Coordinates of C-alpha atoms in Angstrom, one line a residue:
Chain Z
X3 CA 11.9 -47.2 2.4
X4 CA 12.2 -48.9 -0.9
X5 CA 9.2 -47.9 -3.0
X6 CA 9.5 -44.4 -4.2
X7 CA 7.6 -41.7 -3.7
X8 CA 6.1 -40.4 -6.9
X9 CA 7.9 -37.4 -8.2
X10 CA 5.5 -33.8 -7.6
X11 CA 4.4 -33.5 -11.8
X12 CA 3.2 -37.2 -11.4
X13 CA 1.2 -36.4 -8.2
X14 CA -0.3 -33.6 -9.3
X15 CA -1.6 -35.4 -12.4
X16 CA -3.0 -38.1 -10.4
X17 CA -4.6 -35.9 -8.3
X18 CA -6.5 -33.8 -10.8
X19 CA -7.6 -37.3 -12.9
X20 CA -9.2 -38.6 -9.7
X21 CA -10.8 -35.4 -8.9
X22 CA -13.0 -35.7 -12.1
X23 CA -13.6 -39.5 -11.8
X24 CA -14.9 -38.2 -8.3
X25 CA -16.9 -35.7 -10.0
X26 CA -18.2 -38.7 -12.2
X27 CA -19.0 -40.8 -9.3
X28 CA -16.5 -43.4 -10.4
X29 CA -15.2 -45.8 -7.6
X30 CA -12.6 -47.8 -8.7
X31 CA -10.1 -47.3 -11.8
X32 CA -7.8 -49.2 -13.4
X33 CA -4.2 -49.1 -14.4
X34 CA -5.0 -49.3 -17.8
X35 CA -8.0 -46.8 -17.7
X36 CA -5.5 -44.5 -16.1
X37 CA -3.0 -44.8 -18.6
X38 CA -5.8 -43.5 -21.3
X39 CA -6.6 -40.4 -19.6
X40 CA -3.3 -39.2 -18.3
X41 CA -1.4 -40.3 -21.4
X42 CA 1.1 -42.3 -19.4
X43 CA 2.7 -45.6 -19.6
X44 CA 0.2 -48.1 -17.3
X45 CA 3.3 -50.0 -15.8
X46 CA 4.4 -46.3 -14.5
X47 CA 1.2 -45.6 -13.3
X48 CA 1.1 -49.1 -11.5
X49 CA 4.8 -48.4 -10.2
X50 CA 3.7 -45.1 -8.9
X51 CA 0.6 -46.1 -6.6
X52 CA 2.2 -48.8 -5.4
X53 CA 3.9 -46.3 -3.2
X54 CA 0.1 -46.7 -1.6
X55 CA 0.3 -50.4 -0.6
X56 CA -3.4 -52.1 -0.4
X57 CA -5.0 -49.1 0.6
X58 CA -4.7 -47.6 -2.8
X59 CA -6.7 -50.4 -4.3
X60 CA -10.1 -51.5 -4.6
X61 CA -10.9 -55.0 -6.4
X62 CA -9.0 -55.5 -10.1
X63 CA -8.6 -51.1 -9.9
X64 CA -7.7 -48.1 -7.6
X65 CA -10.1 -46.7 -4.9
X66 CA -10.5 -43.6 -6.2
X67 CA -11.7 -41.8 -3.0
X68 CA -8.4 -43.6 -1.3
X69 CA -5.6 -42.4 -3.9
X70 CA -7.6 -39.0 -4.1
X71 CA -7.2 -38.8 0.3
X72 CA -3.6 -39.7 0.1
X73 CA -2.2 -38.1 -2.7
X74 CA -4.2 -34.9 -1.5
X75 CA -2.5 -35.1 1.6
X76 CA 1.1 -34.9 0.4
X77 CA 0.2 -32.6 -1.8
X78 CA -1.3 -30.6 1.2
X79 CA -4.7 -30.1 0.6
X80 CA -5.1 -31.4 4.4
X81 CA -2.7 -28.5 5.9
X82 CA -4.1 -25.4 6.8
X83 CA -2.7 -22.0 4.6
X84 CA -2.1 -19.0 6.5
X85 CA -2.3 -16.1 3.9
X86 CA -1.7 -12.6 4.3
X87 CA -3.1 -9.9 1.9
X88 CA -1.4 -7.0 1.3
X89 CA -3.7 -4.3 0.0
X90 CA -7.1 -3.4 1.5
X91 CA -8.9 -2.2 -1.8
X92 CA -11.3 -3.6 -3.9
X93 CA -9.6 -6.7 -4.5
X94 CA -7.6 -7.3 -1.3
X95 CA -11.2 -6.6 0.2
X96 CA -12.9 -9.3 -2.2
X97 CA -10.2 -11.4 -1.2
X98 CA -10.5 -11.1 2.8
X99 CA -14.3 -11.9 2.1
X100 CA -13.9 -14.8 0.1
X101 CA -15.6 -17.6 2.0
X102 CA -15.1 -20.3 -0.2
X103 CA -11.5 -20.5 -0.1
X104 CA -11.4 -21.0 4.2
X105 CA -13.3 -24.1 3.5
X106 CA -11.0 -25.4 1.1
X107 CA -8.1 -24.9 3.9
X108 CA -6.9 -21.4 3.1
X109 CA -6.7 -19.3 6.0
X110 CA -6.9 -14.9 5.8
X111 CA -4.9 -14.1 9.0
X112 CA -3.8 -10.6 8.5
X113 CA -4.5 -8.0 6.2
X114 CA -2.5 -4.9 5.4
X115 CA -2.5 -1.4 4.1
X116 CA -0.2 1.9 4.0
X117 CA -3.3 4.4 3.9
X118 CA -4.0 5.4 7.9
X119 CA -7.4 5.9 6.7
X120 CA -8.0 1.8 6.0
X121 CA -5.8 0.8 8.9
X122 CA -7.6 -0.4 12.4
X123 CA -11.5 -0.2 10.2
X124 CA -12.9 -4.1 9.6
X125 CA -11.6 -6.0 6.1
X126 CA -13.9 -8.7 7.1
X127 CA -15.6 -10.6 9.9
X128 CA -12.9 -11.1 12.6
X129 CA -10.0 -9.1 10.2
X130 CA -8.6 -5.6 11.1
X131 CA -6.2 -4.2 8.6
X132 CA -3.0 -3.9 10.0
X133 CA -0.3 -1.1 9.3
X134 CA 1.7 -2.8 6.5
X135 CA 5.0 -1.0 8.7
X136 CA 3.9 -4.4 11.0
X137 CA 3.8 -6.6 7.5
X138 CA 7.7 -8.5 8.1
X139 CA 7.0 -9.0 11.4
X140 CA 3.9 -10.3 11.4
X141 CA 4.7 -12.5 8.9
X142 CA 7.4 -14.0 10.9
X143 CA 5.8 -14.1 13.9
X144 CA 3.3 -16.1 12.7
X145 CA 4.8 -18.4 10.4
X146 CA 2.5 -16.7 7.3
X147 CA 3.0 -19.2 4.1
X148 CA 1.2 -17.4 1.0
X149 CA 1.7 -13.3 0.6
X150 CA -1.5 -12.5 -1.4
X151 CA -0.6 -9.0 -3.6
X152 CA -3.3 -6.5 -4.0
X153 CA -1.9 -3.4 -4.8
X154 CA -1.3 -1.1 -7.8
X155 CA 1.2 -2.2 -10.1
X156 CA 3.7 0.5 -8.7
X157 CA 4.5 -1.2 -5.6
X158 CA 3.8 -4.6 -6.5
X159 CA 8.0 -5.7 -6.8
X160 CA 8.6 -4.0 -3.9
X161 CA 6.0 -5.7 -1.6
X162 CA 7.1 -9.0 -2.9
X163 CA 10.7 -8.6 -1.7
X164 CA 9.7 -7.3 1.6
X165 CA 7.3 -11.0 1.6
X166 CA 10.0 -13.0 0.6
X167 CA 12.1 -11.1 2.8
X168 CA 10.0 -12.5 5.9
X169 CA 9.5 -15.4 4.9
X170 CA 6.8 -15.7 2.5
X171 CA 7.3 -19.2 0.8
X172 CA 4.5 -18.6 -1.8
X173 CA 2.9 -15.8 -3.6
X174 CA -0.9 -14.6 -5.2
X175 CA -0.6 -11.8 -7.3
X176 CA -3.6 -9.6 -8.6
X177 CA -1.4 -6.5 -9.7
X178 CA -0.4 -6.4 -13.5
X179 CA 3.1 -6.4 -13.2
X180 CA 5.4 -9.3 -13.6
X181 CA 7.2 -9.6 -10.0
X182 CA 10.6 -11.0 -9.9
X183 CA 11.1 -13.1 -7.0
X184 CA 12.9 -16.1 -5.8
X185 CA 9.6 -17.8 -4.1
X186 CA 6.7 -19.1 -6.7
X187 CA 4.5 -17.0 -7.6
X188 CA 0.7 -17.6 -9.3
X189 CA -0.8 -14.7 -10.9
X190 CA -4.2 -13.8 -11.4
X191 CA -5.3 -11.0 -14.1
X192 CA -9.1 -10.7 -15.2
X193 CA -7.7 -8.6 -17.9
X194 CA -5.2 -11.0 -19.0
X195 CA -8.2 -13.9 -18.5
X196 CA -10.6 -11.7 -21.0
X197 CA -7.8 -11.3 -23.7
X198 CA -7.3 -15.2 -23.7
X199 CA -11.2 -15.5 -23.6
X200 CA -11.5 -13.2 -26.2
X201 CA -8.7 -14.7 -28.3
X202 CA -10.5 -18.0 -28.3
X203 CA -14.0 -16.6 -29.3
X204 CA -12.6 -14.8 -32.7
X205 CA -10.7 -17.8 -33.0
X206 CA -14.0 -19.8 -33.5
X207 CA -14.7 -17.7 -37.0
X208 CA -13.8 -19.2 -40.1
Chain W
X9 CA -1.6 -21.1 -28.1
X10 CA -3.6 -18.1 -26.9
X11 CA -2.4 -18.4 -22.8
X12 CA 1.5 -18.0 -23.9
X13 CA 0.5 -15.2 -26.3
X14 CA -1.4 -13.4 -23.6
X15 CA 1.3 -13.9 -21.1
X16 CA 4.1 -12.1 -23.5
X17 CA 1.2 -9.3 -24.5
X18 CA 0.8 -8.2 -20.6
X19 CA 4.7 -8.3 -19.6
X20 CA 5.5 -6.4 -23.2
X21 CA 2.6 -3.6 -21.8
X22 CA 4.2 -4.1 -18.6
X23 CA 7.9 -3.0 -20.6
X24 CA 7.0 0.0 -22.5
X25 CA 4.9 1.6 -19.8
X26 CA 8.5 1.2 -17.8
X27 CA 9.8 2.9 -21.0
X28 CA 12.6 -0.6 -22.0
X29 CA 12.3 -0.8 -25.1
X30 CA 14.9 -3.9 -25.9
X31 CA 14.3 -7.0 -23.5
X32 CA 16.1 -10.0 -23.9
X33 CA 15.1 -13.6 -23.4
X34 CA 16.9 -14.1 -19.6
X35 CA 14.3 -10.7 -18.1
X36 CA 11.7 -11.8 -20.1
X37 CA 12.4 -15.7 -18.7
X38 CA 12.6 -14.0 -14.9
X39 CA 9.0 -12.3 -15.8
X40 CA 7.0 -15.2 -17.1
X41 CA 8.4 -17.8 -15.3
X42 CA 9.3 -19.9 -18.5
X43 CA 12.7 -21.1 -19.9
X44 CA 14.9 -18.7 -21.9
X45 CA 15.5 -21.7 -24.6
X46 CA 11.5 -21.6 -24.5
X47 CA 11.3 -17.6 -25.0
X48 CA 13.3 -17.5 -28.1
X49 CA 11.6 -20.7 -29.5
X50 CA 8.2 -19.0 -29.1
X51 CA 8.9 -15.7 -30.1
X52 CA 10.5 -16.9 -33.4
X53 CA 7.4 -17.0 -34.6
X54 CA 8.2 -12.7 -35.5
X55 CA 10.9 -13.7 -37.5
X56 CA 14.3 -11.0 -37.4
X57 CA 11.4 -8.1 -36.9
X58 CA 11.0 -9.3 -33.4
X59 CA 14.7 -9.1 -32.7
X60 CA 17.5 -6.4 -31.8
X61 CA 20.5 -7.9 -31.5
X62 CA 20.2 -10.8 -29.3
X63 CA 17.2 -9.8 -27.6
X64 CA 13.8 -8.5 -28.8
X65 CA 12.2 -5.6 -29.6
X66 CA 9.3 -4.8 -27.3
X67 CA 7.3 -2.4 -29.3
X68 CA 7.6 -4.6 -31.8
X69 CA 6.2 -7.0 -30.6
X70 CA 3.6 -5.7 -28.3
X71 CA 2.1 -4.0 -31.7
X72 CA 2.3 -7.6 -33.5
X73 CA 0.8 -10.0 -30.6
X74 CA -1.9 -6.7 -29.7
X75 CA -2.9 -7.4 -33.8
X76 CA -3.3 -11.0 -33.5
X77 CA -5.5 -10.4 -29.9
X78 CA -7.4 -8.2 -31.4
X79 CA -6.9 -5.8 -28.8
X80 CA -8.4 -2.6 -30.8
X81 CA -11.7 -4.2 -30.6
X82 CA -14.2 -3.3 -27.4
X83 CA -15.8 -5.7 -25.6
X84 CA -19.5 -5.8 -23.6
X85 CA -19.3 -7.4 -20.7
X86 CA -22.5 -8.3 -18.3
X87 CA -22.3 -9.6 -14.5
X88 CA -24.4 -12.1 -12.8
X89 CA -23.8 -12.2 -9.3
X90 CA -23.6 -8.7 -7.4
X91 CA -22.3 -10.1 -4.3
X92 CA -18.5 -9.8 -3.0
X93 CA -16.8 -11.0 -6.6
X94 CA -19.6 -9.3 -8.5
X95 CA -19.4 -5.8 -7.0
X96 CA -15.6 -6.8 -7.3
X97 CA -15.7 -6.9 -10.8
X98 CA -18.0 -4.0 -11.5
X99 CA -15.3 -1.9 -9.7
X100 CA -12.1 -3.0 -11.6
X101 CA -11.8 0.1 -13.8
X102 CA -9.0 -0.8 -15.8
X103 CA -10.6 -3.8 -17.0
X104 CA -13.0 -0.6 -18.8
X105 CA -10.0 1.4 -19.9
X106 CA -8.5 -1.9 -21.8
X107 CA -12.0 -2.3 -23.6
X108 CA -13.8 -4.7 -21.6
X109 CA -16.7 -2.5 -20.4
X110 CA -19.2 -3.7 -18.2
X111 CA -23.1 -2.8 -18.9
X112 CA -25.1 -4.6 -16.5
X113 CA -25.3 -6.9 -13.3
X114 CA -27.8 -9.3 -12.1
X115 CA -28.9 -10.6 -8.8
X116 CA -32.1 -12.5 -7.5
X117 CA -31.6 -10.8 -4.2
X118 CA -34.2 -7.9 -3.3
X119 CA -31.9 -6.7 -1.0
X120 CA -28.9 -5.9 -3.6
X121 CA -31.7 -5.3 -6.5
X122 CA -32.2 -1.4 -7.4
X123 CA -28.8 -0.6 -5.4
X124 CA -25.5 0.2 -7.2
X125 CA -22.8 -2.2 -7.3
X126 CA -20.3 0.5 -8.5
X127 CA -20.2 4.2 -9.8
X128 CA -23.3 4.7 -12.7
X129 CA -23.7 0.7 -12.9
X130 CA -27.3 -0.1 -11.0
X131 CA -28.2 -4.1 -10.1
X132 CA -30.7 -5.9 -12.1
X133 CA -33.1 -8.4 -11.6
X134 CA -31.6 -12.0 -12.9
X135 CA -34.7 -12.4 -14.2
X136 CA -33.8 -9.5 -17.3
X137 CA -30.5 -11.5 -18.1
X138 CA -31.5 -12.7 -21.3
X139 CA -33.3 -10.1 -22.1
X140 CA -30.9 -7.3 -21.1
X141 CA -28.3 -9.8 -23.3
X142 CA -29.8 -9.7 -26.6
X143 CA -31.4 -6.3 -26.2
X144 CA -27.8 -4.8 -25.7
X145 CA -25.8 -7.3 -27.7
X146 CA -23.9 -7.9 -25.0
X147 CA -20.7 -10.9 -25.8
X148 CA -19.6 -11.8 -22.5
X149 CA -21.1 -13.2 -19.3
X150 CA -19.0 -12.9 -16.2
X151 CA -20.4 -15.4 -13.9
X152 CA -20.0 -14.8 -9.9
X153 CA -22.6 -16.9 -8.6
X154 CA -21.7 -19.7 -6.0
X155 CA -21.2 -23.1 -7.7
X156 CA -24.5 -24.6 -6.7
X157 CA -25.9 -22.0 -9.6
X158 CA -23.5 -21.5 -12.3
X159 CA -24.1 -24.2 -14.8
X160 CA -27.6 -22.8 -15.4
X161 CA -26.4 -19.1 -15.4
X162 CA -24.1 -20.0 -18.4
X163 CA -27.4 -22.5 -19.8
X164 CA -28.9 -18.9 -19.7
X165 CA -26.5 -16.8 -21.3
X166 CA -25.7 -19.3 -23.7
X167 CA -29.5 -19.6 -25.0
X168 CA -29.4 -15.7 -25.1
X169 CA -26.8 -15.4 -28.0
X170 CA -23.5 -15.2 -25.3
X171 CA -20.4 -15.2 -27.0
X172 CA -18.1 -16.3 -24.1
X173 CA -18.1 -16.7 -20.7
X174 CA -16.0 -15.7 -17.8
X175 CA -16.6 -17.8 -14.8
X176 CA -15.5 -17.5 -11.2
X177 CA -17.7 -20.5 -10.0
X178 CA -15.3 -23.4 -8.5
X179 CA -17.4 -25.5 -10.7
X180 CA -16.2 -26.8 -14.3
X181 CA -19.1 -25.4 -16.7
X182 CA -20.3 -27.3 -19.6
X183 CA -21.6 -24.9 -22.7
X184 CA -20.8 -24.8 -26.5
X185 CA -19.1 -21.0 -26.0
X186 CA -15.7 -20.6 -25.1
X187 CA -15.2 -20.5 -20.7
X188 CA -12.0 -19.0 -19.2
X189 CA -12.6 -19.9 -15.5
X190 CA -11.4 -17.6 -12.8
X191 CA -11.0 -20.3 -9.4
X192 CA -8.6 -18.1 -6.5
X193 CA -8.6 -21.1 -4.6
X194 CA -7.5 -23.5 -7.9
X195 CA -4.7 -20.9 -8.4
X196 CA -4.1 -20.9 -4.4
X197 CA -3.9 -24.7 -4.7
X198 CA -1.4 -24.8 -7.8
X199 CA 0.7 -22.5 -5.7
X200 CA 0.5 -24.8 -2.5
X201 CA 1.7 -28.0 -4.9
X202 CA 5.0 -25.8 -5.8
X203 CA 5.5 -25.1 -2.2
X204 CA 5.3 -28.7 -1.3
X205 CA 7.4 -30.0 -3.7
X206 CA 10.1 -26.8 -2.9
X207 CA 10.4 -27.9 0.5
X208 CA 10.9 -31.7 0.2

């Protein structure tokens, strides 16, 4: 147990560079090459894929598709997400229908809502929303990693404890409120997307 | 840098809609995720005007980074793709009330053509999106079309005077106009490689 296993920031780096060569239809990278695109010493980069003996190489580079498998599987792209969505509206909706996302690996197991009037009618194909009164234990029963947030601002903080509270070791949040938890959390905002969109088109003027 | 900026703009809203109106760098470092060093080294930038006491003033600086957003100014918006994000889109009404206000959304289905996506917002044929674009000046395309599509939506927009595009294809799109890209399972996937290194 000698060679180390590169730290997570590393990882993630090499992942996302050998998506794109992937994308490119490159093969086989080297060292060197590497060291150009990430910005990072070649001898680190060489130290770090080490950690994938032989496998990780292909002739005088890397075999792209190989580093790409392996590093995506510590990283877990291979492990299958059980998400809950909290919030049966528009967006917690569009969220339970997103197809997409179950190939990628991420799995919409439950969905729930306060309003007696959304609970037991159809989120999606297969998903019933569920009284959010069942959302801790639920989450515990089933082991639930990611708490997707999809409702109004107001009780945004307060769903997030109850997540974290569970068990929740990840959240998604679509309500515009920071939320103050220990667990990470990734926030999406199509209002906060526009201003930076919008910000970067004026900025074009000169 | 624009991201940063934005982030401080929608957690100062956030603040005075709550009513605080000093926040120092520790809540705002709890809010945004960043470090509290990295707070006050960013929002230097206001000079003493940002600051009361030791912390910041949160009007103040929601007026000051609105100004340099450009927040006063209203935005057209089109949609291409009336489907699940589409219709999703078309019926996020406080998107409208900040001054991005949708005018029109395209499909090439029959099926979803003529039909309304949301409240006084009707589909369109795909076919009208240039035309529709230049005709009502619109400045941003919202694309929610499946990968396999997008790059030539935004080839389309982009010939048709587009300004910017938002784009909720998990596909990297290649145009001259500024794209802000919109991928829930990129941002799923980010999460996932924080979990994974938390529990190791």
């Amino acid at each position: 147990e000698k060679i180390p296993k590169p730290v997570s920031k590393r990882l993630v780096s090499y992942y996302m560079c050998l998506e794109r060569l992937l994308d490119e239809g490159v093969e086989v990278v080297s060292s060197e090459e590497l060291a150009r695109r990430l910005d990072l010493k070649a001898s680190q980069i060489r130290k770090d894929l080490s950690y994938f003996g032989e496998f990780g190489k292909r002739g005088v580079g890397y075999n792209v598709e190989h580093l790409y498998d392996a590093i995506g599987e510590i990283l877990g792209v291979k492990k299958e997400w059980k998400l809950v969505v909290v919030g049966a509206g528009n967006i917690g909706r569009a969220v339970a229908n997103y197809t997409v996302m179950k190939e990628k690996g991420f799995r919409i197991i439950g969905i729930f809502d306060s309003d007696p009037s959304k609970i037991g009618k159809e989120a999606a194909p297969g998903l019933t929303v569920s009284d959010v009164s069942e959302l801790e234990k639920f989450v515990e029963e089933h082991g639930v990693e990611i708490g997707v947030i999809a409702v109004p601002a107001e009780h945004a903080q307060e769903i997030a404890e109850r997540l974290e509270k569970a068990g929740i070791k990840g959240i998604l949040n679509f309500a515009p409120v920071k939320i103050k938890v220990s667990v990470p959390v990734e926030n999406i905002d199509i209002t906060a997307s526009l201003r930076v969109l919008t910000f970067e088109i004026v900025r074009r003027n000169s």
